[PDB]
Design an enzyme around this catalytic site. Sequence first.
Site, PDB file in Angstrom:
ATOM      1  CE  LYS A   1      -3.789  -2.241   1.301  1.00  0.00           C
ATOM      2  NZ  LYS A   1      -3.418  -3.757   1.577  1.00  0.00           N
ATOM      3  CB  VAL A   2       3.587   2.195  -2.050  1.00  0.00           C
ATOM      4  CG1 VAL A   2       4.787   3.246  -2.174  1.00  0.00           C
ATOM      5  CG2 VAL A   2       4.312   0.716  -2.183  1.00  0.00           C
ATOM      6  CB  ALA A   3       0.313   5.727   0.959  1.00  0.00           C
TER       7      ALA A   3
ATOM      8  CD  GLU B   1      11.240  13.687  -4.485  1.00  0.00           C
ATOM      9  OE1 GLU B   1      10.148  13.226  -4.116  1.00  0.00           O
ATOM     10  OE2 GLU B   1      11.568  14.407  -5.034  1.00  0.00           O
TER      11      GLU B   1
ATOM     12  N   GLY C   1     -11.144  -8.713   0.545  1.00  0.00           N
ATOM     13  CA  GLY C   1     -12.255  -8.704   1.090  1.00  0.00           C
ATOM     14  C   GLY C   1     -13.285  -9.783   0.724  1.00  0.00           C
TER      15      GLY C   1
ATOM     16  CD  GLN D   1     -11.872  -7.230   4.183  1.00  0.00           C
ATOM     17  OE1 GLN D   1     -12.294  -6.136   3.834  1.00  0.00           O
ATOM     18  NE2 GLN D   1     -10.569  -7.636   3.981  1.00  0.00           N
TER      19      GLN D   1
ATOM     20  N   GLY E   1     -17.163 -10.271   1.475  1.00  0.00           N
ATOM     21  CA  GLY E   1     -17.131 -10.452   0.063  1.00  0.00           C
ATOM     22  C   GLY E   1     -17.456 -11.745  -0.381  1.00  0.00           C
TER      23      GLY E   1
ATOM     24  N   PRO F   1     -16.879 -15.134  -3.256  1.00  0.00           N
ATOM     25  CG  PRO F   1     -15.713 -17.003  -2.725  1.00  0.00           C
ATOM     26  CD  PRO F   1     -17.093 -16.100  -2.189  1.00  0.00           C
ATOM     27  N   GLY F   2     -17.602 -16.037  -5.948  1.00  0.00           N
ATOM     28  CA  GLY F   2     -18.205 -15.970  -7.282  1.00  0.00           C
ATOM     29  C   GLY F   2     -18.771 -14.635  -7.835  1.00  0.00           C
TER      30      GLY F   2
HETATM   31  O1  LIG Z   1      -9.178  -2.934   0.272  1.00  0.00           O
HETATM   32  C1  LIG Z   1      -8.213  -3.637   0.569  1.00  0.00           C
HETATM   33  C2  LIG Z   1      -6.896  -3.617   0.466  1.00  0.00           C
HETATM   34  N1  LIG Z   1      -6.278  -4.614   0.877  1.00  0.00           N
HETATM   35  N2  LIG Z   1      -6.768  -5.589   1.527  1.00  0.00           N
HETATM   36  C3  LIG Z   1      -6.012  -6.550   2.071  1.00  0.00           C
HETATM   37  O2  LIG Z   1      -6.053  -7.669   1.529  1.00  0.00           O
HETATM   38  C4  LIG Z   1      -6.051  -9.024   2.653  1.00  0.00           C
HETATM   39  C5  LIG Z   1      -7.591  -9.269   2.774  1.00  0.00           C
HETATM   40  O3  LIG Z   1      -7.589 -10.441   4.164  1.00  0.00           O
HETATM   41  P1  LIG Z   1      -8.680 -11.142   4.532  1.00  0.00           P
HETATM   42  O4  LIG Z   1      -9.094 -12.060   3.325  1.00  0.00           O
HETATM   43  O5  LIG Z   1      -8.273 -11.865   5.751  1.00  0.00           O
HETATM   44  O6  LIG Z   1      -9.661  -9.912   5.001  1.00  0.00           O
HETATM   45  C6  LIG Z   1      -5.138  -8.349   3.723  1.00  0.00           C
HETATM   46  O7  LIG Z   1      -3.711  -8.481   3.652  1.00  0.00           O
HETATM   47  C7  LIG Z   1      -5.686  -6.758   3.663  1.00  0.00           C
HETATM   48  O8  LIG Z   1      -4.653  -5.942   4.293  1.00  0.00           O
HETATM   49  C8  LIG Z   1      -7.859  -5.622   2.087  1.00  0.00           C
HETATM   50  O9  LIG Z   1      -8.474  -6.539   2.765  1.00  0.00           O
HETATM   51  N3  LIG Z   1      -8.681  -4.534   1.381  1.00  0.00           N
END
Ligand SMILES: O=c1cnn([C@@H]2O[C@H](COP(=O)(O)O)[C@@H](O)[C@H]2O)c(=O)[nH]1
Lengths: 212, 212
Positions: free
Chosen positions: A62-64, A68, A171, A175, A177, A179-180
Amino acid sequence: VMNRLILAMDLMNRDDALRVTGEVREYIDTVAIGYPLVLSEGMDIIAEFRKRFGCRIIADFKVADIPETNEKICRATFKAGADAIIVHGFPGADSVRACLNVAEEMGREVFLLTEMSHPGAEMFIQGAADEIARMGVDLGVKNYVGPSTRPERLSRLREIIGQDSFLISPGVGAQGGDPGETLRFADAIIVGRSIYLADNPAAAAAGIIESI
Amino acid sequence: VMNRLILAMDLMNRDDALRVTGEVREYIDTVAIGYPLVLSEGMDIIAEFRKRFGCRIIADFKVADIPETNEKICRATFKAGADAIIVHGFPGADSVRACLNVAEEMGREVFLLTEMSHPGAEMFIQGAADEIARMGVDLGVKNYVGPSTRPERLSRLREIIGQDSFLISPGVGAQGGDPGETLRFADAIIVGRSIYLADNPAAAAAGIIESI
Ligand SMILES: O=c1cnn([C@@H]2O[C@H](COP(=O)(O)O)[C@@H](O)[C@H]2O)c(=O)[nH]1
Ligand SMILES: O=c1cnn([C@@H]2O[C@H](COP(=O)(O)O)[C@@H](O)[C@H]2O)c(=O)[nH]1
């Protein structure tokens, strides 16, 4: 990627991370390694994984930062053996271009994170996501990350980046989400906890693959 | 590597190279690309292959120059996206170290070619091969290339580099080497013409895999 499934390996100790990754290697050939593992075991873990499992490694960093610093982070990450790096687009075009320039120099790839999957993403990121995706298209970005938790947003993102771009999506599972549904728009799904915290990670991976 | 089989893609035109590689991708996930294809279609073909087939690419460039030039060749090759490069050991340790230094900087790998598979290798290379392999061990080289056509030499090479080193071997099929016998000592075999000149490359790859 194999079975359109990428393992997010966020365990924090080398022994457990190696065990779970080895157990699911027959189902997955691409692993996302992030800071939880790298800051606990060192950057050398990337080359160890790549060699031991023969998998592609995406550094989910998550480079932010400013341009430089982004260049330095990308150089150190590719030196460690990562095949690709995930970069935030909200810091702007110059910051993304810095990453693209190092990837070009080192023969690697940049994935642009456009909208995040967690609830807080609705506060500021969601409102800028379409423009962040369009910025990526304008910069020549070909790999993107979008949210499994909001398929209507994933659809809009796919609309902006086109069918030729590669889109991966986290996700899934923990979280909320699916898969399908996610794979209707994304090329691959990223799954962490649903696999690595399972009593049988291989059975969990196999079950996700069978559901799709 | 998948099925312990690496495809040597030495066709000289992009359309035929892409066709054959796509036809055998279900059996092989690692491709060796050399100068016949690169000097005919350009270095951009490496990134095209890597993306289109999601395979690892070994640049079989037989690097054999002075240290300074070897460094430039390796940098250009890794910039193009190659995962590894094959380097000759007969030019000496400084030349190999130059390649190892660039691979370290770019997070990639060097394969040391110790003894070649063709008849002419008996003239000068064979007599120096054991020492070239020992030199590799002393330099920390972990990936080697040895001849399928001389299994007794492949055995001696494995003896010097140890069981932990990775050894790949060309000369299978067209040059007379046998897949099974070679895999008694090598971790993977490199096969070119027996697959890419076959009327059915996929059937040829499948047949090699079934024989082992
Ligand atoms: O919007 C984003 C971006 N990245 N991740 C990352 O994806 C992985 C999802 O893991 P999980 O299946 O255990 O929720 C983790 O490494 C998390 O930092 C998210 O969950 N959501
Ligand atoms: O000692 C060596 C080193 N390299 N190669 C290479 O490996 C491939 C073998 O191809 P073939 O299966 O068609 O003979 C070719 O790219 C060739 O340059 C050999 O054959 N022998």
